[PDB]
Tab-separated table of C-alpha atoms in Angstrom:
chain	number	residue	atom	x	y	z
A	5	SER	CA	-18.850	-71.678	1.186
A	6	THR	CA	-20.592	-68.791	3.405
A	7	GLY	CA	-19.549	-65.896	4.996
A	8	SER	CA	-21.310	-63.748	7.952
A	9	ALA	CA	-20.265	-60.299	9.294
A	10	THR	CA	-21.830	-57.822	11.575
A	11	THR	CA	-22.264	-54.342	10.285
A	12	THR	CA	-22.310	-51.475	12.830
A	13	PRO	CA	-23.867	-47.871	12.442
A	14	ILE	CA	-20.978	-45.335	12.317
A	15	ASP	CA	-22.805	-42.686	14.544
A	16	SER	CA	-26.244	-42.402	16.597
A	17	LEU	CA	-28.167	-41.424	13.423
A	18	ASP	CA	-27.271	-44.596	11.390
A	19	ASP	CA	-25.571	-42.114	8.871
A	20	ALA	CA	-23.820	-45.414	7.439
A	21	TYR	CA	-22.534	-48.826	8.446
A	22	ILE	CA	-19.331	-50.317	8.695
A	23	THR	CA	-18.316	-53.842	8.225
A	24	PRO	CA	-14.787	-55.347	9.208
A	25	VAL	CA	-12.931	-56.675	5.991
A	26	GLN	CA	-9.601	-58.694	6.280
A	27	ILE	CA	-7.320	-57.558	3.444
A	28	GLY	CA	-3.852	-59.277	2.762
A	29	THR	CA	-1.310	-61.651	4.366
A	30	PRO	CA	-1.083	-61.337	7.323
A	31	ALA	CA	-4.818	-59.794	7.664
A	32	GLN	CA	-4.905	-55.847	7.721
A	33	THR	CA	-8.778	-55.475	9.059
A	34	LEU	CA	-10.373	-52.378	7.662
A	35	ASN	CA	-13.826	-51.061	8.466
A	36	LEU	CA	-15.604	-50.673	5.044
A	37	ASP	CA	-18.907	-49.273	3.838
A	38	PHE	CA	-20.897	-52.055	1.952
A	39	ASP	CA	-22.396	-50.207	-0.830
A	40	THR	CA	-24.872	-52.004	-3.023
A	41	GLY	CA	-24.955	-48.841	-5.177
A	42	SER	CA	-21.500	-49.002	-6.521
A	43	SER	CA	-19.060	-51.580	-7.445
A	44	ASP	CA	-15.502	-50.636	-6.583
A	45	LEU	CA	-13.700	-51.975	-3.301
A	46	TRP	CA	-11.574	-49.193	-2.334
A	47	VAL	CA	-9.427	-48.465	0.666
A	48	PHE	CA	-7.466	-45.919	2.521
A	49	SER	CA	-3.895	-46.764	2.126
A	50	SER	CA	-0.124	-46.068	2.350
A	51	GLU	CA	-0.547	-44.395	-0.925
A	52	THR	CA	-3.154	-41.872	0.216
A	53	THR	CA	-2.125	-38.180	0.016
A	54	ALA	CA	-0.996	-37.763	3.742
A	55	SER	CA	-3.128	-34.474	4.339
A	56	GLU	CA	-6.297	-36.254	3.266
A	57	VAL	CA	-5.714	-39.150	5.799
A	58	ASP	CA	-7.457	-38.281	9.485
A	59	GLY	CA	-7.834	-41.035	11.690
A	60	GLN	CA	-8.800	-43.948	9.143
A	61	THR	CA	-7.117	-47.242	9.153
A	62	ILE	CA	-4.938	-47.736	5.967
A	63	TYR	CA	-4.084	-50.985	3.958
A	64	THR	CA	-0.259	-50.966	3.294
A	65	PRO	CA	0.297	-53.395	0.431
A	66	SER	CA	3.992	-53.664	1.047
A	67	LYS	CA	3.387	-55.202	4.189
A	68	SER	CA	1.127	-58.145	2.531
A	69	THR	CA	2.825	-61.083	1.089
A	70	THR	CA	-0.117	-61.651	-1.257
A	71	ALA	CA	-0.312	-58.260	-2.698
A	72	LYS	CA	0.342	-57.677	-6.275
A	73	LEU	CA	0.279	-54.508	-8.284
A	74	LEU	CA	-2.355	-54.789	-11.063
A	75	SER	CA	0.119	-53.137	-13.564
A	76	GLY	CA	-1.191	-50.090	-15.321
A	77	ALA	CA	-4.724	-50.155	-13.520
A	78	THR	CA	-6.112	-46.894	-12.326
A	79	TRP	CA	-9.603	-46.117	-11.023
A	80	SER	CA	-11.672	-42.983	-10.302
A	81	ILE	CA	-15.086	-42.700	-8.904
A	82	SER	CA	-17.676	-39.993	-8.076
A	83	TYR	CA	-20.600	-40.709	-6.005
A	84	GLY	CA	-24.148	-39.344	-5.909
A	85	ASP	CA	-23.394	-36.967	-3.000
A	86	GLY	CA	-20.609	-35.403	-4.733
A	87	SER	CA	-17.778	-37.186	-3.090
A	88	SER	CA	-14.821	-39.031	-5.026
A	89	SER	CA	-11.657	-40.953	-4.811
A	90	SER	CA	-9.106	-42.324	-7.222
A	91	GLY	CA	-6.029	-44.404	-7.357
A	92	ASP	CA	-4.177	-47.447	-8.523
A	93	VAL	CA	-4.927	-51.069	-8.011
A	94	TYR	CA	-3.642	-54.351	-6.207
A	95	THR	CA	-4.866	-57.638	-6.151
A	96	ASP	CA	-4.914	-59.458	-2.693
A	97	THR	CA	-6.710	-61.886	-0.548
A	98	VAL	CA	-9.927	-60.377	0.874
A	99	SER	CA	-12.138	-62.023	3.643
A	100	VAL	CA	-15.480	-60.955	5.087
A	101	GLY	CA	-16.908	-62.959	7.768
A	102	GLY	CA	-14.893	-66.073	7.065
A	103	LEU	CA	-15.574	-66.045	3.382
A	104	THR	CA	-12.373	-65.702	1.206
A	105	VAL	CA	-11.673	-64.486	-2.084
A	106	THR	CA	-8.116	-64.773	-3.758
A	107	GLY	CA	-7.191	-62.344	-6.359
A	108	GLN	CA	-9.574	-59.711	-5.482
A	109	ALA	CA	-9.148	-56.137	-6.874
A	110	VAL	CA	-8.243	-53.891	-3.957
A	111	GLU	CA	-8.263	-50.136	-5.251
A	112	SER	CA	-5.780	-48.136	-3.359
A	113	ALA	CA	-6.590	-44.687	-3.000
A	114	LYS	CA	-4.116	-41.759	-3.920
A	115	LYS	CA	-6.574	-39.098	-3.459
A	116	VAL	CA	-9.851	-38.901	-1.547
A	117	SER	CA	-12.374	-36.047	-1.296
A	118	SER	CA	-13.158	-33.996	1.749
A	119	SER	CA	-16.256	-35.738	2.993
A	120	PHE	CA	-14.114	-39.172	3.066
A	121	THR	CA	-11.197	-37.528	5.037
A	122	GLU	CA	-13.577	-36.069	7.385
A	123	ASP	CA	-15.199	-39.311	8.188
A	124	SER	CA	-12.661	-41.291	10.509
A	125	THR	CA	-14.836	-44.285	11.000
A	126	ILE	CA	-15.076	-45.336	7.262
A	127	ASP	CA	-11.671	-46.849	5.871
A	128	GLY	CA	-13.270	-47.267	2.333
A	129	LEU	CA	-15.884	-48.874	0.506
A	130	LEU	CA	-16.881	-52.458	-0.621
A	131	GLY	CA	-19.131	-52.315	-3.860
A	132	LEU	CA	-21.851	-54.812	-4.135
A	133	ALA	CA	-23.644	-53.351	-7.433
A	134	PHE	CA	-23.093	-55.230	-10.686
A	135	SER	CA	-19.469	-55.313	-11.952
A	136	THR	CA	-20.334	-53.333	-15.154
A	137	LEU	CA	-20.067	-50.485	-12.879
A	138	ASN	CA	-16.676	-51.033	-11.715
A	139	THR	CA	-14.394	-48.182	-12.559
A	140	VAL	CA	-10.876	-49.925	-12.996
A	141	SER	CA	-9.203	-48.952	-16.331
A	142	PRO	CA	-8.330	-50.147	-18.769
A	143	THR	CA	-9.488	-53.784	-17.402
A	144	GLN	CA	-12.618	-53.657	-15.305
A	145	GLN	CA	-12.594	-55.556	-12.306
A	146	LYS	CA	-15.215	-57.796	-10.492
A	147	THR	CA	-16.871	-57.052	-7.161
A	148	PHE	CA	-16.168	-59.336	-4.305
A	149	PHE	CA	-19.593	-61.010	-4.536
A	150	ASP	CA	-18.912	-61.532	-8.221
A	151	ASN	CA	-15.601	-63.248	-7.480
A	152	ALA	CA	-17.073	-65.325	-4.563
A	153	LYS	CA	-20.427	-66.253	-6.403
A	154	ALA	CA	-19.436	-69.701	-7.748
A	155	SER	CA	-17.906	-70.670	-4.576
A	156	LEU	CA	-21.072	-69.864	-2.471
A	157	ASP	CA	-23.656	-72.477	-1.332
A	158	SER	CA	-26.255	-70.263	-3.029
A	159	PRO	CA	-25.400	-67.261	-5.010
A	160	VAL	CA	-26.819	-64.647	-2.684
A	161	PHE	CA	-26.186	-62.208	-0.025
A	162	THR	CA	-28.314	-60.516	2.493
A	163	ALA	CA	-28.407	-57.084	4.218
A	164	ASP	CA	-30.054	-57.078	7.548
A	165	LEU	CA	-29.394	-53.566	8.858
A	166	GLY	CA	-30.223	-52.329	12.394
A	167	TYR	CA	-32.007	-49.383	13.356
A	168	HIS	CA	-29.549	-47.502	16.168
A	169	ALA	CA	-27.970	-51.242	16.456
A	170	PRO	CA	-25.789	-53.623	14.770
A	171	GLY	CA	-26.959	-55.930	11.848
A	172	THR	CA	-25.370	-58.422	9.528
A	173	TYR	CA	-24.384	-59.064	5.968
A	174	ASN	CA	-24.327	-62.764	5.158
A	175	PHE	CA	-22.915	-64.297	1.843
A	176	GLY	CA	-24.105	-67.675	0.370
A	177	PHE	CA	-26.969	-68.430	2.625
A	178	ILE	CA	-30.554	-67.117	3.789
A	179	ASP	CA	-30.709	-67.076	7.626
A	180	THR	CA	-34.344	-68.184	7.796
A	181	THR	CA	-34.291	-67.066	11.750
A	182	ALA	CA	-33.545	-63.487	10.819
A	183	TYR	CA	-37.244	-62.504	9.413
A	184	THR	CA	-40.591	-62.966	10.043
A	185	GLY	CA	-43.234	-64.184	7.649
A	186	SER	CA	-42.091	-64.815	4.147
A	187	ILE	CA	-39.760	-63.152	1.484
A	188	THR	CA	-41.310	-61.693	-1.190
A	189	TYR	CA	-39.138	-61.691	-4.488
A	190	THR	CA	-39.324	-59.015	-7.180
A	191	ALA	CA	-37.856	-58.555	-10.522
A	192	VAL	CA	-34.439	-56.702	-10.952
A	193	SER	CA	-33.201	-54.707	-14.032
A	194	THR	CA	-29.398	-54.772	-14.295
A	195	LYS	CA	-29.567	-52.219	-17.164
A	196	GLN	CA	-28.204	-49.514	-15.238
A	197	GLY	CA	-25.732	-51.719	-13.179
A	198	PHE	CA	-27.816	-51.441	-10.001
A	199	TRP	CA	-30.092	-53.586	-7.956
A	200	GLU	CA	-33.086	-51.944	-9.631
A	201	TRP	CA	-36.630	-52.738	-8.734
A	202	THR	CA	-40.173	-51.296	-9.075
A	203	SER	CA	-42.173	-51.003	-5.833
A	204	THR	CA	-45.891	-51.355	-6.063
A	205	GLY	CA	-46.918	-48.256	-4.082
A	206	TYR	CA	-46.866	-46.664	-0.525
A	207	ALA	CA	-48.957	-45.656	2.299
A	208	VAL	CA	-48.299	-42.842	4.899
A	209	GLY	CA	-49.131	-43.731	8.492
A	210	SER	CA	-52.384	-45.393	8.864
A	211	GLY	CA	-53.629	-43.981	5.447
A	212	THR	CA	-54.975	-46.103	2.498
A	213	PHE	CA	-52.510	-47.787	0.312
A	214	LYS	CA	-51.752	-45.845	-3.069
A	215	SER	CA	-51.020	-48.588	-5.706
A	216	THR	CA	-48.564	-46.917	-8.211
A	217	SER	CA	-45.086	-48.198	-9.737
A	218	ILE	CA	-41.973	-46.800	-8.256
A	219	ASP	CA	-38.746	-47.749	-10.028
A	220	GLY	CA	-35.740	-47.335	-7.644
A	221	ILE	CA	-32.520	-49.078	-6.541
A	222	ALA	CA	-31.803	-50.899	-3.386
A	223	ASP	CA	-28.746	-48.913	-2.111
A	224	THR	CA	-27.107	-49.819	1.161
A	225	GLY	CA	-24.652	-47.000	0.605
A	226	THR	CA	-27.227	-44.202	0.581
A	227	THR	CA	-28.372	-43.179	4.100
A	228	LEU	CA	-31.921	-41.763	3.163
A	229	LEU	CA	-35.147	-42.802	1.209
A	230	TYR	CA	-35.317	-40.692	-2.090
A	231	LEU	CA	-38.540	-40.740	-3.784
A	232	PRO	CA	-40.723	-38.930	-6.231
A	233	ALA	CA	-41.689	-35.360	-5.237
A	234	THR	CA	-45.537	-36.209	-5.100
A	235	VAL	CA	-44.858	-39.071	-2.528
A	236	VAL	CA	-42.684	-37.061	-0.589
A	237	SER	CA	-44.842	-34.085	-0.371
A	238	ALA	CA	-47.954	-36.496	0.666
A	239	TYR	CA	-45.648	-38.015	3.460
A	240	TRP	CA	-44.607	-34.558	4.860
A	241	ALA	CA	-48.160	-33.077	4.738
A	242	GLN	CA	-49.086	-35.309	7.506
A	243	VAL	CA	-46.430	-33.678	9.774
A	244	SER	CA	-47.462	-30.355	11.519
A	245	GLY	CA	-44.903	-27.693	10.647
A	246	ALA	CA	-42.756	-29.712	8.102
A	247	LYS	CA	-41.686	-28.018	5.053
A	248	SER	CA	-39.008	-28.215	2.195
A	249	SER	CA	-36.186	-25.974	2.899
A	250	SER	CA	-33.890	-24.720	0.032
A	251	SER	CA	-31.334	-23.459	2.575
A	252	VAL	CA	-31.021	-26.749	4.420
A	253	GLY	CA	-31.470	-28.850	1.450
A	254	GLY	CA	-34.578	-30.622	1.859
A	255	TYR	CA	-37.470	-31.417	4.113
A	256	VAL	CA	-37.333	-30.528	7.562
A	257	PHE	CA	-39.570	-30.841	10.455
A	258	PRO	CA	-40.161	-29.757	14.236
A	259	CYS	CA	-38.174	-31.855	16.477
A	260	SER	CA	-41.201	-32.077	18.913
A	261	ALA	CA	-43.176	-33.885	16.155
A	262	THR	CA	-44.183	-37.525	16.216
A	263	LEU	CA	-43.536	-38.997	12.650
A	264	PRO	CA	-45.859	-41.117	10.997
A	265	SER	CA	-44.684	-44.456	9.577
A	266	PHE	CA	-44.226	-45.070	5.678
A	267	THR	CA	-45.064	-48.149	3.999
A	268	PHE	CA	-43.553	-49.319	0.774
A	269	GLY	CA	-44.990	-52.288	-1.611
A	270	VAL	CA	-43.075	-55.259	-2.601
A	271	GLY	CA	-45.342	-57.132	-5.056
A	272	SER	CA	-48.384	-57.861	-2.672
A	273	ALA	CA	-46.410	-57.507	0.222
A	274	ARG	CA	-45.861	-54.472	2.349
A	275	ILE	CA	-42.734	-53.253	4.377
A	276	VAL	CA	-43.501	-50.699	7.163
A	277	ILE	CA	-40.755	-48.090	8.097
A	278	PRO	CA	-41.593	-46.795	11.594
A	279	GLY	CA	-41.704	-43.117	12.069
A	280	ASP	CA	-38.610	-42.956	14.358
A	281	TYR	CA	-36.465	-44.463	11.568
A	282	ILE	CA	-37.414	-40.940	9.401
A	283	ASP	CA	-35.821	-38.802	12.148
A	284	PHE	CA	-32.248	-37.688	11.411
A	285	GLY	CA	-32.174	-35.172	14.152
A	286	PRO	CA	-31.208	-31.561	14.590
A	287	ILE	CA	-30.091	-29.702	11.396
A	288	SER	CA	-27.170	-28.412	13.478
A	289	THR	CA	-26.363	-28.914	16.997
A	290	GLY	CA	-28.919	-27.518	19.208
A	291	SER	CA	-31.479	-26.924	16.738
A	292	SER	CA	-35.301	-27.706	17.167
A	293	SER	CA	-35.406	-28.134	13.269
A	294	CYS	CA	-34.951	-31.881	12.470
A	295	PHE	CA	-33.784	-33.247	9.141
A	296	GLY	CA	-36.200	-35.659	7.507
A	297	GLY	CA	-35.234	-39.281	6.331
A	298	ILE	CA	-37.494	-39.165	3.338
A	299	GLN	CA	-36.529	-36.819	0.747
A	300	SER	CA	-37.324	-35.982	-2.997
A	301	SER	CA	-35.509	-37.726	-5.718
A	302	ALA	CA	-36.320	-35.036	-8.187
A	303	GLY	CA	-33.049	-33.895	-9.919
A	304	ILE	CA	-31.167	-36.938	-8.664
A	305	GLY	CA	-32.762	-38.764	-11.841
A	306	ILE	CA	-33.325	-42.194	-9.838
A	307	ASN	CA	-35.310	-43.227	-6.818
A	308	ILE	CA	-33.241	-44.535	-4.046
A	309	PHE	CA	-34.212	-46.991	-1.378
A	310	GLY	CA	-31.401	-46.237	1.000
A	311	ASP	CA	-31.008	-47.500	4.606
A	312	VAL	CA	-34.070	-45.678	5.869
A	313	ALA	CA	-36.012	-48.258	3.804
A	314	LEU	CA	-33.662	-51.320	3.766
A	315	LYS	CA	-33.319	-51.279	7.661
A	316	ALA	CA	-37.112	-52.095	7.824
A	317	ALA	CA	-36.602	-55.099	6.111
A	318	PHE	CA	-34.514	-58.246	5.619
A	319	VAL	CA	-33.193	-57.974	2.106
A	320	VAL	CA	-31.939	-60.712	-0.198
A	321	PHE	CA	-29.716	-59.794	-3.241
A	322	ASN	CA	-30.139	-62.893	-5.498
A	323	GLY	CA	-27.192	-62.915	-7.769
A	324	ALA	CA	-28.596	-66.053	-9.761
A	325	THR	CA	-28.488	-65.960	-13.540
A	326	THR	CA	-31.711	-63.704	-13.683
A	327	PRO	CA	-31.025	-61.677	-10.466
A	328	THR	CA	-34.056	-60.766	-8.209
A	329	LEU	CA	-34.399	-59.006	-4.829
A	330	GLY	CA	-36.176	-60.271	-1.786
A	331	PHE	CA	-37.768	-58.360	1.097
A	332	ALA	CA	-39.196	-59.684	4.410
A	333	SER	CA	-40.412	-57.992	7.513
A	334	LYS	CA	-38.254	-58.603	10.539
């Protein structure tokens, strides 16, 4: 089997992407944030504290003839941005782009933090990291991909995120028309439960490539590109007037600037992030200070190849017995 679904930016900045997902019988379609940095599929629901729901579409398990309470199971998750959610668990039928999994754990939120409430466009998350990170207790549950894998034509999914435009998540096949040149594959460590890999270096604009190992994670659920302070300083040094602002919480730059590109290495290959992808717009409405899309990972404890990086590539998440990651230009 295969599946193919369009993913759409939630706003004009590509702060996140949502993908329609069918849950239950009859189908209830929710728009979920596919997150290769976590491993829980959780949704706003009829069980979510009423004051914490503001415009989201909810899953109502009592209206699904295939929903079953997973007795005794609870979940609770906290994300890198400080947001969180928790609740109980149903199993139900879940379909993405024509690919169906029966008996998928659907984690129903009883509580969500304010950042989730405040984002009316995201109805929940669909985790695509390794199932070892799944938070369900006392019996850990599998991700949608893990459950689908044996049925797929090939044990892979791909992320093709757009810049200010829709893109695609495919399951079970590689669309050879969706990228240019060849796909370069690189080793993955699953030791921390992430799609963790090592970039071979970087360049800023038209500058020379610096060969250096940068260990980080491919994370579709993180907006920005978080890299070591040395690398980030070298980037922003090429933008007149750019500075790190403790009050704002990162590097800012004059909105009048033209940003240089940023290149990262994948083996001997190179992915070029155009300068415009690094512009996250005014820090507040009407400001001429703009927020940068490349930020320091210092004090995160891990480097993160988030959407800024991934949307410059066609990315293969290869879930074969020894997982790997592939990157192509597009």
